[PDB]
Design an enzyme around this catalytic site. Structure first.
Site, PDB file in Angstrom:
ATOM      1  N   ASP A 259      -8.968  -1.851   1.620  1.00  0.00           N
ATOM      2  CA  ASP A 259      -9.035  -1.133   0.174  1.00  0.00           C
ATOM      3  C   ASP A 259     -10.289  -1.747  -0.728  1.00  0.00           C
ATOM      4  OD1 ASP A 259      -6.828   0.506   0.485  1.00  0.00           O
ATOM      5  OD2 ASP A 259      -5.488  -0.822  -0.359  1.00  0.00           O
TER       6      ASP A 259
ATOM      7  N   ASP B 276       0.968  -1.361  -0.115  1.00  0.00           N
ATOM      8  CA  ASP B 276       0.097   0.104  -0.090  1.00  0.00           C
ATOM      9  C   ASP B 276       0.783   1.181   0.138  1.00  0.00           C
ATOM     10  OD1 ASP B 276      -1.936   2.052   1.062  1.00  0.00           O
ATOM     11  OD2 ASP B 276      -3.270   0.299   1.016  1.00  0.00           O
TER      12      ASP B 276
ATOM     13  N   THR C 128      -3.388   6.063  -3.178  1.00  0.00           N
ATOM     14  CA  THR C 128      -2.187   7.086  -2.837  1.00  0.00           C
ATOM     15  C   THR C 128      -0.744   6.831  -3.639  1.00  0.00           C
ATOM     16  OG1 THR C 128      -1.520   5.212  -1.335  1.00  0.00           O
ATOM     17  CG2 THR C 128      -3.498   6.523  -0.701  1.00  0.00           C
ATOM     18  N   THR C 129      -0.566   5.611  -3.846  1.00  0.00           N
ATOM     19  CA  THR C 129       0.522   5.382  -4.775  1.00  0.00           C
ATOM     20  C   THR C 129       0.602   6.359  -6.104  1.00  0.00           C
ATOM     21  OG1 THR C 129       1.011   3.621  -3.933  1.00  0.00           O
ATOM     22  CG2 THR C 129       1.962   3.771  -6.287  1.00  0.00           C
TER      23      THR C 129
HETATM   24  N1  LIG Z   1      -5.065  -6.596 -14.378  1.00  0.00           N
HETATM   25  C1  LIG Z   1      -4.482  -5.168 -14.804  1.00  0.00           C
HETATM   26  N2  LIG Z   1      -4.053  -5.060 -15.899  1.00  0.00           N
HETATM   27  C2  LIG Z   1      -3.701  -3.613 -16.219  1.00  0.00           C
HETATM   28  N3  LIG Z   1      -3.881  -2.524 -15.397  1.00  0.00           N
HETATM   29  C3  LIG Z   1      -4.079  -2.839 -13.994  1.00  0.00           C
HETATM   30  C4  LIG Z   1      -4.504  -4.239 -13.642  1.00  0.00           C
HETATM   31  N4  LIG Z   1      -4.839  -4.116 -12.343  1.00  0.00           N
HETATM   32  C5  LIG Z   1      -4.703  -2.844 -12.157  1.00  0.00           C
HETATM   33  N5  LIG Z   1      -4.215  -1.989 -12.991  1.00  0.00           N
HETATM   34  C6  LIG Z   1      -3.980  -0.653 -13.030  1.00  0.00           C
HETATM   35  O1  LIG Z   1      -2.936  -0.246 -12.032  1.00  0.00           O
HETATM   36  C7  LIG Z   1      -3.176   0.597 -11.197  1.00  0.00           C
HETATM   37  C8  LIG Z   1      -2.883  -0.029  -9.838  1.00  0.00           C
HETATM   38  O2  LIG Z   1      -2.730   1.037  -8.909  1.00  0.00           O
HETATM   39  P1  LIG Z   1      -2.647   0.574  -7.259  1.00  0.00           P
HETATM   40  O3  LIG Z   1      -1.582  -0.458  -7.093  1.00  0.00           O
HETATM   41  O4  LIG Z   1      -3.986   0.149  -6.914  1.00  0.00           O
HETATM   42  O5  LIG Z   1      -2.234   2.184  -6.565  1.00  0.00           O
HETATM   43  P2  LIG Z   1      -3.253   2.509  -5.710  1.00  0.00           P
HETATM   44  O6  LIG Z   1      -3.405   1.116  -4.663  1.00  0.00           O
HETATM   45  O7  LIG Z   1      -2.546   3.573  -4.810  1.00  0.00           O
HETATM   46  O8  LIG Z   1      -4.408   2.934  -6.449  1.00  0.00           O
HETATM   47  C9  LIG Z   1      -4.467   1.051 -11.397  1.00  0.00           C
HETATM   48  O9  LIG Z   1      -4.618   2.460 -11.871  1.00  0.00           O
HETATM   49  C10 LIG Z   1      -5.091   0.209 -12.446  1.00  0.00           C
HETATM   50  O10 LIG Z   1      -5.772   0.918 -13.277  1.00  0.00           O
END
Ligand SMILES: Nc1ncnc2c1ncn2[C@@H]1O[C@H](COP(=O)(O)OP(=O)(O)O)[C@@H](O)[C@H]1O
Ligand SMILES: Nc1ncnc2c1ncn2[C@@H]1O[C@H](COP(=O)(O)OP(=O)(O)O)[C@@H](O)[C@H]1O
Ligand SMILES: Nc1ncnc2c1ncn2[C@@H]1O[C@H](COP(=O)(O)OP(=O)(O)O)[C@@H](O)[C@H]1O
Ligand SMILES: [Mg+2]
Ligand SMILES: [Mg+2]
Ligand SMILES: [Mg+2]
Ligand SMILES: [Mg+2]
Ligand SMILES: [Mg+2]
Lengths: 525, 538, 211, 106, 526, 49
Positions: free
Chosen positions: A392, A58, A91-92
């Site tokens: 989350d 996170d 947040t990331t």
């Molecule tokens: N299976 C997937 N394929 C492509 N993109 C993805 C997939 N899962 C998540 N994402 C993208 O990657 C990002 C993940 O961000 P995340 O690690 O959740 O940061 P935060 O938790 O701060 O939102 C999201 O913006 C999402 O759109």
């Protein structure tokens, strides 16, 4: 400097030094938090001063546990904390976008451009970006499948794939259970409990309550099939008067009489409970369970257990509301006048003992409006990670329900917004076009970092996706397995509309305010 | 030209004592090295020929043992990765009871082979995926390796035979004797209901006579003495109280208000008469032994002596509850006489001295009762503690057998068979995961290798012979420790057997620990704090 | 952490992106200090030694020598500028500026994951093409007095103010023309530079002889 | 040895392993036996142990002498423990047990 | 021995003379230079580091000055005058500091030129009187009923802050809050916004969602979950006394010699609570709000009558609720009259914001107190927004109390300087030189505006000065954005007369105070 | 959030005892003040008196 002239022990950075310091701190934060983004991110070990181990991914947790003493880091951490507290995700991405906005702005400021022009460009670009986000959202009925897709898109990023597959079903089912029509969802009515005795994939959803305490009398029943639940907030232990009385006797017989008499107050209330139990169930087939927020002294425990009544003392304050919503009784603050209609019902009450601690299960309720999530795992750090992941996921599902819409993920919306901003750039009058370009390039950080974490190359993957979007016009994101552009909607990768909107607003505001800062002073001593 | 400044960015915003490690070399390899060090540390105490270790904790308490969980607990482990492996070992101990050293050794071997695989070019994700596939394959294979089932738990001989393997890894020399003791203790417990409580087996440590003099008693033994003249009862009718053996007083505040001379004269006489009446009422019910959980008054003791009542005082409420369970009484909260349905019965209660310790014995004569006690003897407190740990392992083995009656061959036969089958499966699997599957299979050799190393023979010859025989088709042939040369023999005929749940949970936990350690990519350690310990741990 | 610190515990190591960050930060710092030197309109710097000796300078090499700097990358840049000054005698500030801007531009693409080797290959190809173009654009011309006066003006106006530069131009051009022999290399040792401390700065001149 | 940036056990831990450790254990047991060697038989002598407070303890009993010696060697403590055990169970022979154990080891 | 003999105590340093005056003037000048760059519509923000660990990223002059610590007493005087200006009128804090610095700068010349400071002070006082007269002369009246004009005034007030991007919303919020706080009882006009216009900051959300509520919002929740969290038209009862059973003041003891006295005493406790709750219920309220605890039995007896209760509410929150819903705080429920019941609130909703419960008493009709709900990026952004809203509300109150307006953007400074110079032209004494010096020292404000905009100071200021020599040119100032001269009649930048008057008075009196000073003595204890 | 780091670049590379005064107010005005102080120091010894 003037401040050092007044206060000799003053730490001051002025003019371009202020921008250099702030941008360096933002770039450091972005460099650390790059590897978190996406399901293909890397987990981090966090070891406290006391030695506690906490594996995490996170952004907010990592920001909290980074050993940082920087002012700009404090500001960004506060922004991330607000983002997490309200929406619960992003947040990331928040930190990444702030840092890249600052870097892109510096790319022009280094050429002698005043930051005010860049901030004006930021504002115009943000307005256009919000318009485009309104344009691109997908207003869909939030059936089970869409909520499952959102839960996947969150949990897969937080945890292992199989654990995420379990947690999606758990979270979605719980949210659907506690949600009433056209009413705000109260997340307090979902209880998250810790058991440390099985594998992580054994986490499930109990359609009832799990209590971290059990009966204190050894003779109480360990498993009650058909139970009447009585949720009470009445003290069943001896309580002294408020006037500092004391007793006065003259013989041993008088002392015994006063000893027997001083317990009559609590004995009357225990007698009321027992009388109700006898009235509602004249047979031993049914069961009676008393859950109390206040304590129960051993004499009352014995008196109750002699009638085959299960009693739990010192329950949680919120457990009163949770049991009222789940079992379906009435939480009484006094036994002045109680009736069978004030008794909740549970189809099964049984006690699970793990090591020294004790647990009580209240399952098989009629239609529980308050359920519980049982987090299981072999380690404490695994339990903490699963707790953060389910937080989350629950926030994501709640946001998806609250908004009638949903936004394609995988960075597709970022690419579309960037191209829309580029097309809108000629409309902006003046040198704010540079700020608009900086904002678009900053928005493009998400697909870049996604491709970078997935192992591909940023430039080629990004230009492929951009060319595909320009050619076809569809919302094409990053395929983390092959690198090819993919339609995020078709493969069910969904973001939260509210999360994206808050991202734009918070990132732009904090970047604008940081850019305009031209002096850091520490002269309060 | 004289110094290398810290890199701009994160490396400059770090705190004073904080440490940051990232990437393969700085983090993953160091974690693997630490786990390998820990595994090597505990390796020498594996199997029947494992050598005991003297461990002095920070409190200068001396531990001698060969139980892996105990050694890891008493060791001040500081590395986070080794800490996680220790958590896995403790979880195995809590869930099953035995197999902690297996967890440690398997996790160490898995992590070493993961380091090798990463060095030859594989990625961390591929290694983790291959290990997970191989773990699933092993869990599928394991049921097919079951050789025999318990098939009876009320039979002393068969239960002792089953427990011999469990308590022969510890206390190798004399395992038949301890097996018989623990089998008797467990068979007395475990009533017609299938539920078996480990907590119902108690161990009393009395020093002096060598461990061969230990015995099992169908009752409870307390290291104290009576409080009255009476010190023996042959037909005990114990009545148990949780209140102090004294006149109950008001909870608010007691003040003897005297307004005339007659009240002053009569107060003490009335108090004494009331106490005598209460004690006489207790005695007239037939009760001749009274057990109380609190202070004993002097007048109450006087009247107990007058009516020939044996007084025993128990400080621990746990001991009070255990005694109530043993005898069959209910702890009365007041000094009221007990009714006939809540007055416990014991076939003999007496005060005796064993060694030089006075003990009160609540002794039955039937081969039944809720709680049994194993009174250990010996010449050293440390040795008796070791025997107690062995008894704990045996009781946990019995509990596991009650939960699941399937058994697998011991002595490394099961590990070799699992390795062979997983290697055969991996040979059929294309893609990059075949390397990880083969490495996971090869990691199982760490068990027979450690056994052979401890027994003093050449491990390589033993493993080659094990593969030869298993390829011939004998799936129950393991390492023969009763020989000065590398040799193998059939475990089913010999009788070395391991519980199915033990191996199942051990493999699961070791794999999970190794995978979790591999998953870490960056480490951020805060500066260590020298405070008065965290308040959560008291 | 690093292997070196394992072998030598008191060792300072900056690896991978840390090395690039350190070097580029040092180069950008030197560039930021020396930006204001370039051109006749640049500002003057007063350099005070430890002993208290005051030295006003605008020359890039002199400023590099007398900045209180202890950085390795700054040391390499200073060595390059020292060689440039020793052989050619002019262009040190431009040297530092071009190095700093090259590193900044290269980092602009390296921060996007691009390997530095590709940037270096592009640098070499660009350098070859630029050298060809510079060969094309040079103005070959027999240099009479006025062209030399123009060159001397272009240098001295950047080093000192207007009237002083105007005096020094005639002085240096006439000196070079006096000591130069046709179709022979010029020996700058034959132009003695003597210091007197009694008149105004505009009284400096050339003596067709020796002092 | 290598510095090992993060060390496994707590800093300052002492470990002894192998044949030398066992030999040192045997030697320590010999040392403990020697302290009570001359107090055996009708010709045995007494020992006088002064504690930190100044009190003297003059005794021939092996268990008493071993107790008044604040032994801290982990291997040597076993001889004191068996002397206490013999005193508890039997009451005599506390000198013979230590001599016999040390002689077995030797 | 023979310890040294001396008149004053040790560590008692004393210095006097011209160098003391120079040190005072340099201290004031340095304090001015600290915040010189934070004036105008293109000011740059500063990031103050709180000693406790916080961060104050601000642009307001008083915040910056009060967050720093100094040792020179003249700097302390300047900090104090900044605080005085902030408290008295609300804004103008960074302008008065600059003006005081410039006035002392121009006084130093005469001090070094053999002029006695009393002469300079007399000239300064004459100049200040003439500035007050000129400002009163050039001002223009304003009708407070013109909502658009009031909004424009607030806009000109906050156009120099970080909230100028949402200026429209901010102006509407500030104006509405001030208008609904405006109260008058017993023939006493009252606008008390520091007590009855509360600003509550909750992070997250967007700043476009911030609004002023027709009621009060507090961070509380129902004591018991069975109580309603949504009541349409509540009747509110406000209490400041516990609903429990507490000890009396006198030392009371009970002597229990009978069996039934203990249970009887406990039953009397319960009966007393029941009687108290019955007295509350007799007025048939819907919600009960108390500043002190409410016992569990009291909660039960209230819920039996379908009443919502809020347990512990701060005193100021209770006063705000009383003003908003027309209630009246009472202590003993036995004296609870009908007029004390708060009717007028149109909704009581207790919703969840983030992960906390917030109580809303919004939808009141004619409320005399309100809460401003600020939702934004984070804590520091919201703190700056709150500061800007405070500035706007203070300006609105100043205009409402005094409806006079004067041109901004340096037009007032140039007009006053020109008038002062024209008046001094007739002076014949030696005091004319400091009189002029301060008159043209007033011109620092347009110069600072031009410098902050980035334009050329000298030619723009010269052209402005030449323009002000004409007749109908009192309203000519500069643009803080374009850096050009512009008539304030068309730019629309105006500011209250009271603010400018207070600024000039405070600056001149600070100069007077520091000019009188000589012979600094330090080191002595209490 | 309790310390202001030195700005990256020249500020960090400066030696421990060195001082760098740059800009108008930090250099020119300080030089002017020092020269004015020196002139004021020697002023009173000017002329026949
Ligand atoms: N299976 C997937 N394929 C492509 N993109 C993805 C997939 N899962 C998540 N994402 C993208 O990657 C990002 C993940 O961000 P995340 O690690 O959740 O940061 P935060 O938790 O701060 O939102 C999201 O913006 C999402 O759109
Ligand atoms: N007589 C024997 N011959 C060969 N192997 C044995 C014999 N007895 C026990 N073992 C092996 O020793 C292992 C037990 O090692 P142990 O020290 O108990 O580790 P843990 O305590 O972690 O189970 C078992 O796997 C068993 O197969
Ligand atoms: N658009 C504008 N153009 C030029 N000057 C302006 C403009 N708006 C406000 N000003 C001037 O800026 C000053 C307000 O600056 P501000 O930072 O609010 O100072 P203070 O904090 O002392 O109130 C006023 O004197 C006003 O005349
Ligand atoms: Mg997320
Ligand atoms: Mg074992
Ligand atoms: Mg040159
Ligand atoms: Mg003897
Ligand atoms: Mg203002």
């Amino acid at each position: 400097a003037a401040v050092k002239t007044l206060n000799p022990k003053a730490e001051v950075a002025r003019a371009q030094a202020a921008l250099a310091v702030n941008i360096s701190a933002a770039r450091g934060l972005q460099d650390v938090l790059r590897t978190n983004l996406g399901p293909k991110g890397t987990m981090k070990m966090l070891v406290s001063g006391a030695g506690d181990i906490k594996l995490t991914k996170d952004g907010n947790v990592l920001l909290h546990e980074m050993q940082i003493q920087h002012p700009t880091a404090s500001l960004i951490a506060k922004v991330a904390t607000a983002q997490d507290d309200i929406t619960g995700d992003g947040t990331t991405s928040n930190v990444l976008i702030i840092g890249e906005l600052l870097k892109q702005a510096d790319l022009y400021i280094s050429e002698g451009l005043h930051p005010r022009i860049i901030t004006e460009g930021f504002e115009a670009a943000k307005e256009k970006a919000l318009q485009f986000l309104e344009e691109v959202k997908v207003s869909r009925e939030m059936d089970r499948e869409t909520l499952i897709d959102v839960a996947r898109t969150s949990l897969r990023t937080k945890v292992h794939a199989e654990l995420a597959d379990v947690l999606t079903e758990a979270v979605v089912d719980s949210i659907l259970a506690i949600k009433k029509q056209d009413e705000p969802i109260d997340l307090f009515m979902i209880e998250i409990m810790e058991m440390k005795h099985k594998s992580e994939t054994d986490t499930s959803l109990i359609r009832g309550l799990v209590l971290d305490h059990g009966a204190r009398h050894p003779d109480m029943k360990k498993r009650v099939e058909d139970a009447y639940i009585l949720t009470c907030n009445v003290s069943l232990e001896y309580e002294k008067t408020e006037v500092n009385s004391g007793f006065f006797y003259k013989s041993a017989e008088e002392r015994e009489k006063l000893v027997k008499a001083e317990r009559k107050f609590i004995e009357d209330r225990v007698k009321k409970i027992i009388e109700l139990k006898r009235k509602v169930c004249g047979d031993s087939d049914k069961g009676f369970v008393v859950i109390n927020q206040k304590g129960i002294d051993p004499f009352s425990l014995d008196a109750l257990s002699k009638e085959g009544i299960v009693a739990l003392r010192r329950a949680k304050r919120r457990n009163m509301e949770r049991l009222t919503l789940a079992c379906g009784g009435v939480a009484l603050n006094s036994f002045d006048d109680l009736s069978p209609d004030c008794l909740g019902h549970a189809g099964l009450v049984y006690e699970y003992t793990l090591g020294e601690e004790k647990f009580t299960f209240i399952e098989k309720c009629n239609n529980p409006r308050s359920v519980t999530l049982l987090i299981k795992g072999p380690n404490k750090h695994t339990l903490t990670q699963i707790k953060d992941a389910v937080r989350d996921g629950l926030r994501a599902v709640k946001n998806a329900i609250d908004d009638g819409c949903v936004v394609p993920g995988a960075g597709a919306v970022e690419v579309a917004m960037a191209e829309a901003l580029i097309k809108h750039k000629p409309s902006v009058k003046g040198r704010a076009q540079l700020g608009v370009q900086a904002f678009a390039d900053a928005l493009l950080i998400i697909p870049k970092v996604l491709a970078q974490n997935s192992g591909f190359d940023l430039q080629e993957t990004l230009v492929k996706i951009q060319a595909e979007h320009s050619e076809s016009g569809q919302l094409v994101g990053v395929d983390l397995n092959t690198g090819e552009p993919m339609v995020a909607a078709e493969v069910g990768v969904w973001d939260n509309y509210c999360v994206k909107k808050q991202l734009l607003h918070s990132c732009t505001v904090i970047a604008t305010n940081i850019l305009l800062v031209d002096e850091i002073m520490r002269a309060g001593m | 030209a004289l110094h290398v400044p810290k890199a701009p960015g994160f490396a400059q915003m770090l705190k004073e004592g904080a440490k940051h490690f990232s990437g393969l070399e700085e983090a993953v390899y160091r974690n693997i090295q630490a786990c390998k060090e820990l595994a090597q540390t505990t390796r020498t105490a594996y199997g029947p020929n494992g050598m005991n270790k003297m461990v002095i904790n920070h409190l200068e308490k001396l531990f001698v043992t060969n139980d892996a969980a105990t050694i890891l607990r008493e060791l001040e482990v500081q590395h986070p990765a080794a800490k996680m492996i220790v958590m896995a070992s403790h979880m195995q101990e809590q869930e099953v009871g035995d197999g902690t050293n297996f967890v440690l050794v398997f996790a160490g071997a898995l992590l070493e082979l993961a380091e090798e695989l990463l060095r030859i070019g594989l990625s961390v994700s591929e290694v983790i995926e291959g290990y997970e596939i191989a773990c699933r394959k092993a869990h599928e294979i394991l049921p097919n390796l079951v050789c025999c089932s318990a098939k009876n738990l009320r039979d002393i001989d068969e239960v002792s035979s089953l427990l011999r393997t469990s308590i022969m890894s510890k206390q190798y020399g004399n395992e038949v004797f301890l097996a018989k003791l623990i089998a008797q203790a467990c068979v007395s417990i475990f009533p017609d209901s299938g539920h078996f409580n480990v907590d119902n087996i108690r161990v009393c440590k009395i020093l002096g006579s060598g461990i061969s003099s230990s015995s099992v008693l169908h009752g409870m033994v307390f290291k104290k003495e009576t409080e009255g003249d009476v010190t023996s009862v042959k037909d005990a009718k114990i009545a148990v109280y949780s209140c102090p053996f004294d006149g109950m007083i008001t909870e608010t505040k007691g003040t003897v208000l005297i307004k005339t001379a007659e009240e002053l004269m009569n107060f003490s006489k009335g108090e004494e008469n009331l106490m005598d009446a209460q004690v006489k009422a207790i005695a007239d019910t037939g009760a001749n032994v009274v057990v109380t959980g609190g202070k004993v008054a002097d007048m109450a003791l006087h009247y107990a002596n007058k009516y020939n009542i044996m007084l025993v005082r128990l400080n621990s409420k746990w001991d009070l509850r255990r005694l109530c369970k043993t005898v069959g009484a209910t702890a009365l909260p007041r000094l009221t006489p007990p009714v006939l349905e809540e007055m416990g019965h014991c076939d003999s209660v007496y005060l005796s001295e064993v060694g030089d310790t006075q003990v009160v014995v609540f002794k039955h004569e039937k081969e039944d009762g809720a709680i049994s006690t194993i009174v250990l003897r010996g010449s050293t407190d440390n040795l008796m503690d070791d025997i107690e740990r062995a008894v704990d392992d045996g009781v946990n083995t019995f509990k596991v057998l009650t939960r699941d009656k399937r058994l697998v061959p011991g002595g490394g036969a099961t590990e070799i068979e699992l390795a062979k089958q997983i290697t055969s499966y991996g040979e059929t699997c294309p893609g990059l995961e075949q390397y990880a599957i083969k490495k996971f299979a090869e990691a199982f050799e760490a068990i027979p290798r450690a056994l052979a190393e401890n027994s003093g023979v050449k491990a390589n010859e033993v493993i080659s012979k094990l593969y030869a025989v298993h390829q011939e088709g004998n799936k129950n042939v393991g390492l023969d420790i009763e020989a000065e040369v590398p040799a193998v023999k059939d475990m089913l005929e010999a009788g070395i057997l391991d519980t199915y749940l033990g191996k199942y949970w051990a493999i699961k936990l070791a794999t999970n620990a190794a995978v979790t350690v591999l998953r870490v990519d960056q480490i951020i350690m805060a500066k260590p704090a020298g405070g008065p310990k965290p308040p959560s741990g008291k | 952490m690093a292997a070196v610190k394992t072998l030598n515990p008191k060792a300072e190591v900056a690896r991978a992106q840390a090395a690039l960050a350190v070097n580029i930060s040092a180069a950008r710092g030197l560039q930021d200090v020396l930006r204001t030197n370039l051109g006749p309109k640049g500002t003057m710097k007063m350099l005070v030694s430890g002993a208290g000796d005051i030295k006003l300078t605008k020359d890039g090499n002199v400023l590099l020598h007398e900045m209180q700097i202890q950085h390795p990358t700054a040391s390499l840049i200073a060595k390059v500028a020292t060689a440039q000054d020793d052989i050619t005698g002019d262009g040190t500030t431009s040297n530092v500026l071009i190095i700093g801007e090259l590193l900044k531009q290269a980092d602009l693409y390296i921060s996007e994951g691009l390997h530095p080797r590709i940037i270096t290959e592009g640098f070499e190809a660009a350098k070859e093409k630029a050298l060809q173009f510079l060969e094309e654009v040079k103005v070959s011309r027999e240099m009479d007095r006025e062209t030399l006066i123009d060159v001397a003006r272009t240098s001295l106006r950047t080093k000192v103010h207007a009237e002083l530069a105007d005096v020094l131009t005639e002085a240096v051009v006439d000196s070079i023309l006096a000591i130069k022999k046709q179709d022979e290399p010029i020996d700058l040792f034959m132009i003695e530079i003597m210091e007197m401390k009694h008149k105004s700065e505009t009284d400096t001149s050339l003596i067709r002889g020796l002092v | 040895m290598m510095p090992t940036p993060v060390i496994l056990l707590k800093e300052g831990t002492d470990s002894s392993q192998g044949i030398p450790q066992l030999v040192s254990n045997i030697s320590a047991c010999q040392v403990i036996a020697e302290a009570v060697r001359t107090t055996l038989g009708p010709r045995g002598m007494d020992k006088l142990i002064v504690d930190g407070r100044g009190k003297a303890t003059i005794s021939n009993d092996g268990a008493t002498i071993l107790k008044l010696l604040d032994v801290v060697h982990p291997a040597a403590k076993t001889l004191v423990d068996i002397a206490k055990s013999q005193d508890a169970e039997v009451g005599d022979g506390t000198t013979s047990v230590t001599l016999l154990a040390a002689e077995f080891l030797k | 021995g023979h310890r040294p003999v001396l008149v004053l105590s040790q560590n008692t340093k004393r210095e006097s003379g011209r160098k003391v005056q120079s040190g005072n003037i340099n201290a004031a000048k340095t304090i001015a230079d600290i915040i010189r760059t934070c004036l105008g519509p293109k000011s740059m923000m500063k990031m103050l580091l709180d000693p406790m660990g916080g961060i104050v990223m601000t642009n307001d002059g008083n915040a910056i000055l009060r967050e720093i610590q100094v040792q020179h007493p003249a700097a302390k005087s300047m900090i104090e005058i900044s605080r005085t200006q902030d408290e008295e009128v609300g804004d103008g804090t960074t302008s008065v500091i600059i003006l005081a610095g410039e006035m002392l700068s121009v006084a130093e010349h005469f001090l070094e030129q053999q002029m006695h400071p009393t002469v300079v002070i007399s000239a300064y006082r004459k100049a200040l009187d003439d500035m007050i007269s000129t400002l009163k002369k050039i001002s223009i009246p304003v009708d407070i009923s013109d909502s658009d004009m009031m909004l424009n005034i607030i806009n000109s007030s906050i156009t120099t802050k970080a909230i100028s991007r949402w200026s429209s919303l901010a102006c509407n919020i500030a104006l509405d809050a001030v208008k609904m706080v405006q109260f008058e009882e017993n023939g006493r006009k009252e606008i008390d916004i520091k007590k009855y216009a509360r600003v509550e900051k909750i992070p997250g959300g967007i700043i476009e969602d911030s609004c002023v509520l027709r009621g009060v919002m507090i961070n509380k929740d129902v004591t018991h979950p069975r109580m309603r969290r949504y009541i349409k038209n509540p009747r509110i009862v406000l209490l400041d006394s516990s609903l429990e059973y507490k000890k009396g003041e006198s030392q009371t003891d009970i002597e229990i010699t009978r069996e039934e006295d203990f249970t009887r005493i406990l039953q009397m406790e319960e009966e007393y609570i029941q009687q108290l709750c019955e007295d509350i219920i007799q007025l048939k309220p819907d919600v009960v709000i108390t500043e002190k605890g409410i016992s569990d039995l009291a909660q039960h007896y209230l819920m039996r009558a379908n009443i919502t209760a809020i347990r512990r509410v701060r005193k100021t929150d209770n006063n705000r609720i009383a003003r908003a819903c027309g209630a009246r705080i009472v202590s003993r429920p036995e004296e609870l009259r009908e007029d004390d019941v708060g009717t007028g609130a149109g909704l009581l909703e207790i919703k969840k914001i983030g992960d906390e419960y917030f109580t809303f008493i919004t939808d009141c009709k004619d409320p005399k107190a309100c809460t401003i709900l600020l939702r934004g990026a984070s804590k520091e952004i919201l703190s700056e927004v709150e500061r800007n809203l405070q500035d706007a509300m203070q300006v609105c109150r100043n205009v409402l109390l005094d409806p006079q307006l004067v041109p901004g953007g340096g037009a007032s400074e140039m007009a006053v300087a020109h008038a002062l110079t024209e008046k001094s032209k007739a002076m014949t004494g030696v005091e004319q030189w400091p009189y002029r010096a301060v008159a043209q020292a007033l011109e620092v404000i347009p110069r600072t505006l031009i410098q902050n905009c980035g334009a050329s100071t000298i030619r723009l200021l010269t052209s402005l000065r030449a323009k002000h020599t004409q007749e109908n040119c009192e309203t000519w100032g500069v643009n803080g954005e374009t850096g050009t001269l512009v008539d304030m009649k068309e730019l629309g930048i105006w500011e209250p007369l009271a603010v400018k008057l207070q600024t000039y008075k405070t600056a001149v009196e600070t100069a007077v105070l520091l000019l009188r000073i000589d012979d600094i003595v330090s080191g002595h204890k209490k």
